[PDB]
Scaffold this active site. Structure first.
Site, mmCIF file in Angstrom:
data_model
loop_
_atom_site.group_PDB
_atom_site.id
_atom_site.type_symbol
_atom_site.label_atom_id
_atom_site.label_comp_id
_atom_site.label_asym_id
_atom_site.label_seq_id
_atom_site.Cartn_x
_atom_site.Cartn_y
_atom_site.Cartn_z
ATOM 1 C CG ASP I 43 -2.102 0.939 1.063
ATOM 2 O OD1 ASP I 43 -2.136 1.698 0.073
ATOM 3 O OD2 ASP I 43 -2.993 0.925 1.939
HETATM 4 C C1 LIG Z 1 -0.844 13.006 17.988
HETATM 5 C C2 LIG Z 1 -1.500 13.650 16.770
HETATM 6 C C3 LIG Z 1 -2.914 13.126 16.527
HETATM 7 C C4 LIG Z 1 -3.230 12.990 15.040
HETATM 8 C C5 LIG Z 1 -4.681 12.586 14.785
HETATM 9 C C6 LIG Z 1 -4.939 12.252 13.318
HETATM 10 C C7 LIG Z 1 -6.349 11.717 13.077
HETATM 11 C C8 LIG Z 1 -6.345 10.241 12.684
HETATM 12 C C9 LIG Z 1 -7.606 9.834 11.925
HETATM 13 C C10 LIG Z 1 -7.498 10.059 10.419
HETATM 14 C C11 LIG Z 1 -8.858 9.945 9.733
HETATM 15 C C12 LIG Z 1 -8.772 9.389 8.312
HETATM 16 O O1 LIG Z 1 -8.470 8.257 8.137
HETATM 17 S S1 LIG Z 1 -9.143 10.458 6.891
HETATM 18 C C13 LIG Z 1 -9.888 9.464 5.565
HETATM 19 C C14 LIG Z 1 -10.034 10.315 4.305
HETATM 20 N N1 LIG Z 1 -10.716 9.577 3.254
HETATM 21 C C15 LIG Z 1 -9.999 8.563 2.503
HETATM 22 O O2 LIG Z 1 -8.861 8.343 2.748
HETATM 23 C C16 LIG Z 1 -10.696 7.781 1.393
HETATM 24 C C17 LIG Z 1 -9.797 7.206 0.301
HETATM 25 N N2 LIG Z 1 -8.442 7.137 0.813
HETATM 26 C C18 LIG Z 1 -7.297 7.218 -0.076
HETATM 27 O O3 LIG Z 1 -7.457 7.350 -1.243
HETATM 28 C C19 LIG Z 1 -5.885 7.148 0.504
HETATM 29 O O4 LIG Z 1 -4.967 7.612 -0.446
HETATM 30 C C20 LIG Z 1 -5.510 5.721 0.905
HETATM 31 C C21 LIG Z 1 -6.377 4.702 0.168
HETATM 32 C C22 LIG Z 1 -5.689 5.564 2.414
HETATM 33 C C23 LIG Z 1 -4.053 5.467 0.536
HETATM 34 O O5 LIG Z 1 -3.973 5.444 -0.860
HETATM 35 P P1 LIG Z 1 -2.664 4.736 -1.565
HETATM 36 O O6 LIG Z 1 -3.050 3.370 -2.079
HETATM 37 O O7 LIG Z 1 -2.191 5.589 -2.716
HETATM 38 O O8 LIG Z 1 -1.556 4.600 -0.549
#
Ligand SMILES: CCCCCCCCCCCC(=O)SCCNC(=O)CCNC(=O)[C@H](O)C(C)(C)COP(=O)(O)O
Ligand SMILES: CCCCCCCCCCCCCCCCCC(=O)OC[C@H](COP(=O)([O-])OCC(O)COP(=O)([O-])OC[C@@H](COC(=O)CCCCCCCCCCCCCCCCC)OC(=O)CCCCCCCCCCCCCCCCC)OC(=O)CCCCCCCCCCCCCCCCC
Ligand SMILES: CCCCCCCCCCCCCCCCCC(=O)OC[C@H](COP(=O)([O-])OCC(O)COP(=O)([O-])OC[C@@H](COC(=O)CCCCCCCCCCCCCCCCC)OC(=O)CCCCCCCCCCCCCCCCC)OC(=O)CCCCCCCCCCCCCCCCC
Ligand SMILES: CCCCCCCCCCCCCCCCC[C@@H](O)O[C@H](CO[C@H](O)CCCCCCCCCCCCCCC)COP(=O)(O)OCC[N+](C)(C)C
Ligand SMILES: CCCCCCCC/C=C\CCCCCCCC(=O)O[C@H](COC(=O)CCCCCCC/C=C/CCCCCCCC)COP(=O)(O)OCCN
Lengths: 52, 124, 70, 459, 175, 128, 303, 178, 88, 84
Positions: I43
């Site tokens: 991935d």
């Molecule tokens: C200490 C600091 C705290 C930080 C907190 C951060 C919050 C954590 C929670 C995050 C919430 C989410 O997941 S936000 C979710 C946003 N929506 C999506 O991700 C839908 C489609 N995803 C993609 O297309 C991506 O690229 C993917 C397939 C993952 C990779 O692709 P690759 O195949 O090209 O690697």
């Protein structure tokens, strides 16, 4: 807030100081009159220090 | 600390203020009122030129401690008896100061009690 | 001014016995100094002159009359 | 006094009779010899003065300024040697003639036993400076600058002339000695107030005062390097010399009248020091620093105490040397980069280390680091002003802090950081430039050994 | 040393204690000062003796210039420039002499403060009083003349002060 | 939810907390594309001038010239007497002078009164 | 940082007030101001120190706290004791900076303590030197820091001072112990956290000799100097037993409390920081606001 | 740094950048390796739950609350590599980096030492002189009309050609010149 | 410093070492030129975690713009060599 | 003289999660259906000379045993000498 609290608490500590259960320090010769300022031609009021 | 708590959370009149102490005549307690004694005169204590705040009634032991420190110089642990004597003299001075503090406190308490008794007698 | 020592890459680095013996000697010297001073001069930490109790002093030495003389 | 004046006059036929490729060598050698001759005037006395004749006299206020004036000419020639290379021989000779005439006018101005002769030479210095600025300046603003540098001056100096002749109609003389020995108090009258203003503003415009300082950045930025040096080093000190000489007849009216000028200078040193913080131009920054220092000197002269006069004399000498050195350094940068903008040529310490050392020393001495004579003058003026009023110390401390800030800002912006990538025409520093900076800086650190030589007649 | 007068710069007799070694342990100070003497003081003394004999081989003298007294500014007519010039020069010389007198008294005071050590507050009251009196006199003479000072301004200040003194004395007598 | 970050003048909004970038439209994409086009044209011009071996001296930058000229020589011709400008100039150029004059005059008046009454104790004050 | 900004140059201001102690002792307001300034400085700097990750920053804040303690000593009219503290702090703080620099150099110019793990065995000489330095700084009986800091605490307790100043001095001592044990725990005890390529090396005679000379100093100089200088002040010969040990009990209490708070970092639990931690980590927010609000408002005006 | 930037960042690029930043700051919070590993697999699991999400409005609603959450818990003092733009040795050796053209200003007595170096330098100068004249025409013919749209340079396509604008990329001073 | 002058062989060895400790990868199926997206079925998050591993191994940080377009061990080695100025 | 000795890397199969807190992390991760993909990469921090740790008080008492032995020897010598 931190600075203001610090200043207010320092003023409060000035208003309520800390000391010991002791009396004033006692110095022998008229509270060292001759060696603190001098002026020997005036003969100041003699001081007597308590024996306890 | 307890005196600080008793003065700042109690009433002011029961305990003295260190700035104005003493507030009572010396022989008010007992009449003989012996005088404190001094050993070092003006001239030799000036010659040793100790310090202005070091010229107290414990000066002679300080003079002898300095005499040891000057005489047996390379053996800086030779004269320990005189350090103990000077510490003991300062201990006696501090103990006398504490006794003066307590005497003034008890006189103040006795005066307050006498005033309260007089007020009660007048009221009755 | 030292000896040749090569990197290790994820293992414990090579130790010269000289540095270990010197560090152990100096730690032992410091602890011996502390214990020697405590034995010879124990009064600088615990105190030598007793702290008097003001409440234990009788009224005779402190100049107090039984509340009627004065 | 003629033993100095006559060789200066002979500098002209020698310059005009020199070979086409030997003008610089002859001028430099003989100017250095004339400076060596002028060094003899430093032997002053605690008594009145060195009265050579009825026309010229010397003093321990005049002697350091005369020595600095004589010493400045070889440095001016050495710095002008670079950008006048593609010039015809006649025009190079004319430039050297302008410099020699300026030196002669300054020498005759600083002795000047009489006030009208002093005025005549004090204005005679204008013409060579104006020609130098408006003829051998690079940009198109030089002409405008010249106009300013002229008219401001005259706007202050034409009233002075009137006042001067008026005095000679009442007192009967304008000789400095007779004026000092026969001085009488000035009654607090409107006529006396305007006489005070006429006597004072001509010299206050040349320091310059904070409100009247607009001509100085223009004249300094637009003039060639020799013009900038002579403006910052000597020409600014003419006003201080004039006020020091003329305040004797103004007492006791100075006490009341000094308040507006004291306020203007005390606030203007802060204002100009702050202006130096936000400047995109090196020459403008150095000019505003000069304005701040001369504002402090104005405060010293107005307070009128012995420590004030000693500190003012020391500060004028020190500022002259330091400002000339700073202008020379900026010119050496400009002759390589051709832009005269601080932010463009960066990281020069990596490319020119010895020039960076010169920059550091110049900034340190401008920052008034003890025991430099800059600090001596600064401290004497500060002490005298504190005795004048204890609240001045706030303004002086602010000025010191801002001075340090902008001096180190100018040093760090040009010498430290990363070099500009595209600038590739930075050649190694020549022997001429390094010798110029050394000859600027060594007299300062030699004078800190014998401060009493520059502490004035009140030492 | 004969190079300076002992009366102008007085000094106490400088009593010093005697060494009283209470132990047989030999101190490093005496050995260190003996080796310092041998290694430094002797060659310096020999070089000085050579220099002194070289100086003695060529002896010459210089003299302190003496100045006659001249009528001061009070015996000068209002516009007679010559007498005013002479009086002004004499007044400036006297001003320099008074400055040097104050310098001498200040040097006495500083030497006292350093010498008497921890008891300077009591053992240097004489020098403090001497400097107080000298400073009062100097301040009365020259405090507020400012730059462009002259004998005439000093005389005017003296006349104003003595007029005030005369008026105060008259009022006190007539009180 | 979490406590909100409040941007200020001296602590600006973070790049990832803007409401603007999350709102993507074809017009915004075109704007970003032409911004990159302008930046790339400038970069290409600079690098062509920079990598030239025949080049000597400094690559003159019109932006720097414009900045310096606007800061120094374009102020007065664009100046207009306005109530804001007049008030600010009067305040910032006159108020400090009169404030400091009042302060110093009051201080010296108190000093003169004290020295006239004689209760100033100027002992040892010899250098001025 | 080891020579100028830790032990020699920074004491200069304190030294200045030591030069004018005959005049400082005759004024009571300036003495109170000096005491209050020293107390607030030492407390604030220790509070900032106890939460830093750069080792050099931790030691610098320790230096600032020690300077505040010196100012408190001056404020309580004890200049000679302040000079003695200057002399002892020179030795042991300089050695602490030597050890920190050795750690930094051995780890390829890495200053964050989050990336240094087990060095108790990986480098024993620096470990023992920094342990001795920390024990001298916190105050261990009969070490070089004892003869100074213990007397400082006794004099502050036995004097007519501010209650707030005394309270802040005691809290500053506890926080000193806290950041000392923080450095020890996060630089020597845990598992290694540096990059895999190990370049750790101490066997250079220059480093070893330079550190060991200051080691001998920080062990014996306090005793020899205190027993060789003449007495210059009246001592606190008689003193309450509980208040004689107050400096100690504060030191161990800070030690254990900070050690227990550090031992919880091994737990598999995570929580967002509180406001107090943020205030302490960003240096009371003083460098932020005061380096952005005045300067801008100055520079803008200047244009 | 080396690669040219794009006109914008896609959604997946922003998600990957937030993942990078969150993992780095979690590592900064969790000093020890096992604790960091535990919480890093937890954060990866929390990340991959919305991996297959298809609604772009919902996808933009996601990652944005995530940036807000990150900003709330962002460890005000994160770990920074020493040479990184926030590190303690970011530009330590920038003062030791001297341009190559400075060598042209050396005295002949200085060039007398190191003769082989200056011979090779002369060869490099000749190569640059020819290659630049080729490169100008190459870039002029290859560039789109109206000006470039992306600051990316084409490679060399002929045999004796060199990449356009190569001299100041090849002749960087060094990473640690001294 | 006293840092050995690492070479291309050492860089490649360390990169392959770190990749072989990645248990998501079969060590016997990985190669120097083996792609991450297709040859290994990884991935994008896995690629960024590999970037973390390289960063923590070599002690320097790769910018995101450069890191996101690194898909083979060989080009990672080449990028690190170009950053570190490796001769051979 | 530099470090040119051609150091060779160890075997990657040596590093195992077993016996380390990384095992405990793996056990907690399996209780929720998760696994760490980088567990073996960090095993070397618990494998060699880094396996054995020391406590805080143990670190403080680095040379207490030798110091105590020397102390008792010196005290015995002083007691046997002064009693004469
Ligand atoms: C200490 C600091 C705290 C930080 C907190 C951060 C919050 C954590 C929670 C995050 C919430 C989410 O997941 S936000 C979710 C946003 N929506 C999506 O991700 C839908 C489609 N995803 C993609 O297309 C991506 O690229 C993917 C397939 C993952 C990779 O692709 P690759 O195949 O090209 O690697
Ligand atoms: C400290 C005592 C020293 C006494 C020994 C005698 C020294 C004589 C030096 C006279 C002045 C130097 C002339 C200035 C030009 C510089 C010369 C040069 O080109 O360098 C090339 C030369 C060769 O180097 P290079 O490798 O070829 O070039 C590499 C690059 O140039 C890279 O260059 P760099 O990075 O190496 O920088 C060069 C270096 C040096 O370059 C400079 O910046 C020199 C400037 C120093 C002062 C700056 C102005 C501040 C005002 C102070 C004025 C006091 C002067 C006193 C009398 C001076 C007599 C002439 O810069 C500095 O280190 C900064 C110095 C800052 C000092 C701040 C402290 C001020 C007060 C000091 C005490 C003074 C009075 C004490 C009284 C009480 C005690 C008795 O370098 C040197 O020789 C260095 C000079 C030695 C250091 C001097 C620093 C202090 C000296 C102050 C004046 C003398 C004090 C008198 C007695 C005090 C006791
Ligand atoms: C008279 C009887 C005598 C005996 C008295 C009683 C005996 C002792 C009882 C114990 C008393 C408290 C001791 C525990 C301290 C707290 C430790 C703790 O739990 O920290 C974690 C905890 C939060 O940690 P976290 O955010 O999750 O960090 C995540 C990681 O752990 C991040 O961890 P990391 O790896 O990054 O680093 C760990 C570091 C990071 O931890 C920290 O963040 C430290 C911050 C708090 C600890 C500092 C406490 C010192 C208090 C000084 C206050 C001065 C006045 C300030 C006034 C401010 C005015 C607004 O922690 C440490 O290194 C150790 C902390 C220091 C403890 C050792 C020394 C403290 C004991 C001395 C205190 C007083 C005794 C004096 C002794 C003499 C006897 C008189 O801290 C707190 O919750 C704070 C608790 C107390 C703070 C009080 C300040 C609150 C102010 C609110 C506003 C109030 C109204 C003001 C109105 C103004 C309007 C004008
Ligand atoms: C542009 C940048 C700066 C340039 C230079 C500025 C410095 C020049 C300013 C001149 C200083 C003040 C001039 C006169 C000062 C006299 C004191 C007077 O102001 O105070 C009161 C005077 O009251 C009023 O001020 C009367 C004068 C009012 C008219 C003057 C105009 C006021 C503002 C004008 C300023 C413009 C200056 C620039 C002109 C181009 C005292 O009352 P009084 O006891 O009765 O008078 C005492 C004097 N006597 C004894 C001779 C009679
Ligand atoms: C940098 C540009 C500033 C320009 C300088 C302005 C300040 C100079 C003052 C203005 C000119 C006055 C010249 C006075 C010459 C001195 C002669 C003198 O003082 O004698 C007075 C003469 O006094 C006057 O005549 C003054 C009249 C002024 C007329 C012209 C005014 C010019 C504008 C003045 C307004 C500005 C005032 C402040 C200017 C400060 C600079 C900005 C006595 O006259 P008598 O009749 O002979 O005495 C017998 C009776 N008692």
């Amino acid at each position: 807030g931190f600075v203001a609290f610090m200043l207010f608490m320092f003023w409060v500590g000035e208003i309520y100081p800390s000391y010991q259960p002791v009396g004033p320090k006692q110095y022998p010769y008229n509270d060292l009159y001759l060696e603190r300022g001098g002026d020997p031609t005036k003969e100041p009021e003699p001081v007597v220090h308590y024996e306890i | 600390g307890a005196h600080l708590a008793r003065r700042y959370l109690g009433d002011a009149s029961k305990e003295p203020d260190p700035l104005r102490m003493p507030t009572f005549p010396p022989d008010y307690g007992f009449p003989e009122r012996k005088e404190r004694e001094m050993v070092a005169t003006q001239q030799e204590m000036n010659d040793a030129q100790l310090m202005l705040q070091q010229r107290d009634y414990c000066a002679h032991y300080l003079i002898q401690l300095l005499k040891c420190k000057r005489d047996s110089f390379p053996n800086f642990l030779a004269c320990k008896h005189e350090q103990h004597d000077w510490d003991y003299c300062e201990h006696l001075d501090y103990v006398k100061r504490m006794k003066e503090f307590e005497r003034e406190r008890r006189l103040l308490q006795r005066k307050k009690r006498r005033e309260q008794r007089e007020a009660e007698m007048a009221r009755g | 001014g030292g000896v040749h020592i090569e990197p290790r890459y994820r293992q414990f680095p090579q130790l010269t016995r000289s540095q270990l013996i010197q560090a152990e000697f100096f730690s032992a010297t410091m602890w011996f100094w502390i214990l020697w001073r405590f034995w010879h001069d124990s009064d600088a930490v615990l105190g030598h002159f007793p702290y008097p109790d003001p409440s234990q002093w009788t009224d005779e030495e402190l100049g107090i009359l039984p509340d009627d003389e004065d | 006094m003629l033993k100095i004046i006559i060789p200066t006059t002979m500098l002209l036929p020698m310059t005009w009779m020199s070979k086409h490729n030997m003008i610089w060598i002859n001028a430099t050698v003989h100017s250095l010899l004339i400076s060596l001759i002028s060094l003899s005037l430093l032997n002053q006395l605690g008594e009145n003065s060195l009265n050579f004749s009825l026309t010229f006299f010397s003093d321990s206020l005049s002697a350091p300024l005369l020595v600095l004036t004589t010493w400045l000419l070889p440095l001016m020639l050495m710095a002008s040697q670079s950008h006048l290379s593609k010039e015809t021989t006649t025009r190079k000779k004319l430039y050297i003639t302008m410099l020699i005439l300026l030196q002669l006018f300054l020498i005759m101005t600083f002795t000047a036993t009489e006030l009208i002769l002093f005025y005549i030479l004090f204005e005679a210095t204008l013409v060579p400076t104006l020609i130098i600025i408006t003829r051998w300046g690079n940009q198109t603003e030089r002409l405008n600058a010249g106009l300013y540098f002229l008219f401001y001056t005259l706007a202050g100096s034409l009233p002075l002339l009137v006042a001067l002749v008026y005095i000679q109609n009442t007192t009967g003389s304008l000789n400095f000695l007779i004026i000092h020995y026969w001085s009488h108090p000035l009654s607090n009258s409107w006529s006396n107030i305007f006489m005070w203003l006429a006597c004072i503003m001509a010299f206050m415009v040349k320091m310059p005062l904070y409100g009247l300082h607009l001509w100085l950045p223009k004249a300094h930025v637009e003039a060639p390097i020799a013009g900038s040096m002579v403006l910052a080093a000597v020409l600014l000190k003419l006003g201080g010399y004039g006020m020091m000489r003329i305040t004797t007849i103004l007492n006791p009216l100075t006490n009341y009248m000094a308040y507006p000028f004291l306020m203007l200078s005390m606030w203007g040193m802060i204002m100009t020091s702050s202006i130096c913080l936000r400047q995109t131009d090196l020459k403008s920054l150095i000019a505003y620093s000069s304005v701040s220092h001369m504002a402090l000197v104005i405060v010293a002269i107005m307070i009128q105490t012995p420590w004030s006069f000693m500190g003012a004399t020391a500060l004028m000498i020190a500022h002259g040397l330091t400002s000339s050195m700073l202008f020379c350094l900026a010119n050496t940068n400009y002759e390589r980069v051709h832009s005269r903008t601080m932010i463009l040529a960066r990281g020069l310490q990596t490319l020119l280390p010895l020039m960076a050392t010169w920059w550091l020393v110049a900034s340190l001495t401008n920052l008034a680091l003890p025991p430099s004579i800059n600090l001596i003058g600064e401290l004497f003026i500060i002490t005298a002003s504190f005795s004048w009023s204890n609240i001045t110390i706030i303004l002086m401390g602010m000025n010191m802090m801002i001075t340090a800030l902008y001096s180190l800002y100018m040093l760090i912006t040009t010498q430290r950081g990363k070099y500009t990538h595209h600038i590739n025409n930075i050649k190694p520093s020549f022997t001429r430039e390094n010798a110029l900076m050394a000859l600027h800086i060594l007299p300062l650190l030699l004078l800190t050994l014998n401060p009493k030589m520059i502490l004035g007649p009140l030492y | 040393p004969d190079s300076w007068d002992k009366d102008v710069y007085p000094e106490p007799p400088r009593r010093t204690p005697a060494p009283a070694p209470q132990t047989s342990l030999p101190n490093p100070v005496t050995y260190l000062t003996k080796i310092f003497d041998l290694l430094v003081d002797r060659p310096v003394t020999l070089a000085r003796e050579f220099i002194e004999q070289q100086h003695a081989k060529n002896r010459y003298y210089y003299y302190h210039r003496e100045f006659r007294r001249v009528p001061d500014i009070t015996e000068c007519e209002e516009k007679d420039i010559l007498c005013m010039f002479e009086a002004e020069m004499q007044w400036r010389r006297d001003y320099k002499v008074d400055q040097e007198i104050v310098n001498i008294i200040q040097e006495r005071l500083k030497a006292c403060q350093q010498r008497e050590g921890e008891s300077y507050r009591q053992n240097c009251a004489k020098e403090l009083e001497q400097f107080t009196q000298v400073s009062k006199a100097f301040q009365d003479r020259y405090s507020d003349l400012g730059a462009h000072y002259s004998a005439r301004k000093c005389l005017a200040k003296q006349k104003q002060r003595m007029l005030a003194e005369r008026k105060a004395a008259k009022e006190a007598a007539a009180a | 939810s979490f406590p909100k970050y409040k941007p200020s003048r001296l602590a600006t909004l973070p790049a990832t907390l803007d409401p603007a970038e999350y709102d993507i439209s074809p017009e915004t994409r075109k704007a970003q594309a032409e911004r990159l086009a302008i930046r790339s044209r400038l970069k290409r011009e600079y690098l062509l001038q920079y990598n030239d071996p025949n080049r000597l001296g400094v690559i003159e930058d019109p932006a720097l010239i414009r900045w310096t000229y606007a800061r120094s020589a374009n102020i007065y011709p664009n100046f207009r007497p306005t109530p804001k400008t007049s008030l600010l100039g009067a305040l910032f150029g006159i108020g400090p002078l009169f404030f400091w004059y009042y302060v110093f005059k009051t201080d010296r008046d108190k000093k003169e009164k004290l020295i006239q009454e004689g209760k100033l104790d100027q002992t040892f004050n010899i250098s001025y | 940082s080891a020579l100028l900004h830790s032990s020699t140059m920074v004491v200069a201001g304190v030294f200045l007030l030591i030069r004018f102690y005959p005049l400082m002792e005759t004024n009571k307001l300036v003495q109170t101001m000096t005491l209050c300034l020293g107390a607030i400085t030492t407390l604030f700097t220790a509070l900032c120190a106890i939460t830093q990750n750069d080792i050099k920053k931790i030691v610098a804040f320790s230096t600032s706290s020690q300077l505040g303690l010196m100012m408190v000593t001056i404020g309580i009219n004890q200049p000679h004791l302040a000079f003695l503290h200057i002399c002892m702090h020179a030795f042991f703080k300089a050695m602490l900076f030597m050890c920190s620099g050795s750690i930094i150099h051995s780890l390829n110019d890495e200053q964050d303590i989050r990336k240094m793990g087990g060095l108790y065995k990986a480098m024993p000489f620096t470990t023992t030197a920094l342990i001795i330095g920390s024990l001298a700084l916190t105050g261990m009986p009969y070490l070089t820091g004892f003869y100074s800091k213990d007397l400082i605490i006794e004099a502050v307790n036995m004097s007519y001072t501010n209650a707030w100043a005394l309270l802040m001095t005691l809290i500053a001592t506890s926080l000193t112990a806290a950041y000392s044990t923080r450095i020890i725990f996060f630089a020597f005890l845990g598992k290694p956290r540096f990059p895999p390529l190990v370049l750790i090396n101490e066997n250079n005679p220059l480093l070893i000799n330079s550190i060991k000379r200051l080691l001998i100093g920080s062990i014996f100089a306090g005793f020899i100097i205190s027993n060789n200088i003449p007495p210059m002040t009246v001592p606190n010969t008689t003193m309450p037993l509980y208040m004689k040990m107050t400096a100690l009990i504060v030191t161990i209490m800070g030690f254990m409390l900070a050690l227990e708070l550090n031992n919880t970092t091994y737990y598999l639990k995570f929580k967002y920081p509180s406001q107090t931690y943020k205030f302490s980590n960003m240096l009371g927010y003083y460098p932020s606001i005061m380096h952005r609000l005045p300067t801008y408002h100055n520079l803008s005006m200047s244009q | 740094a080396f690669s040219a930037p794009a006109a914008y960042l896609t959604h997946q690029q922003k998600v990957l950048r937030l993942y990078k930043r969150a993992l780095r700051h979690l590592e900064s919070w969790c000093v020890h390796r096992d604790k960091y590993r535990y919480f890093a697999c937890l954060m990866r699991a929390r990340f991959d739950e919305h991996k297959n999400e298809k609604d772009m409005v919902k996808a933009t609603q996601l990652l944005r609350q995530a940036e807000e959450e990150f900003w709330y818990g962002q460890h005000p003092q994160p770990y920074i590599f020493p040479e990184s733009p926030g590190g303690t040795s970011y530009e330590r050796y920038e003062c030791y980096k001297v341009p190559e053209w400075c060598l042209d200003d050396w005295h002949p007595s200085e060039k007398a030492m190191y003769p082989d170096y200056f011979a090779k330098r002369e060869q490099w100068k000749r190569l640059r002189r020819e290659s630049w004249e080729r490169e100008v025409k190459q870039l002029q013919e290859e560039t789109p009309p109206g000006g470039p749209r992306t600051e990316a340079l084409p490679p060399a396509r002929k045999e004796g050609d060199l990449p356009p604008l190569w001299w100041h990329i090849v002749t960087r001073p060094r990473e640690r010149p001294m | 410093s006293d840092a050995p002058p690492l070479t291309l062989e050492a860089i490649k060895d360390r990169v392959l070492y770190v990749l072989k400790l990645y248990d998501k990868i079969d060590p016997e199926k990985l190669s120097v030129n083996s792609h991450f997206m297709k040859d290994l079925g990884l991935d994008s998050l896995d690629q960024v975690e590999i970037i973390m591993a390289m960063e923590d191994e070599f002690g320097f940080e790769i910018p995101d713009i450069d890191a996101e377009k690194l898909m083979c061990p060989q080009e990672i080695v080449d990028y690190i060599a170009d950053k570190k100025d490796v001769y051979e | 003289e530099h470090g040119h000795s051609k150091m060779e890397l160890p075997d990657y199969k040596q590093w195992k999660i077993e016996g380390t807190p990384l095992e405990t992390v793996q056990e907690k991760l399996a209780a929720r259906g998760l696994r760490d993909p980088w567990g073996r990469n960090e095993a070397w921090r618990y494998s060699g000379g880094f396996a054995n740790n020391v406590s805080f008080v143990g670190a403080l008492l680095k040379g207490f045993k030798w110091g105590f032995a020397a102390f008792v020897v010196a005290v015995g010598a002083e007691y046997y000498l002064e009693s004469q």
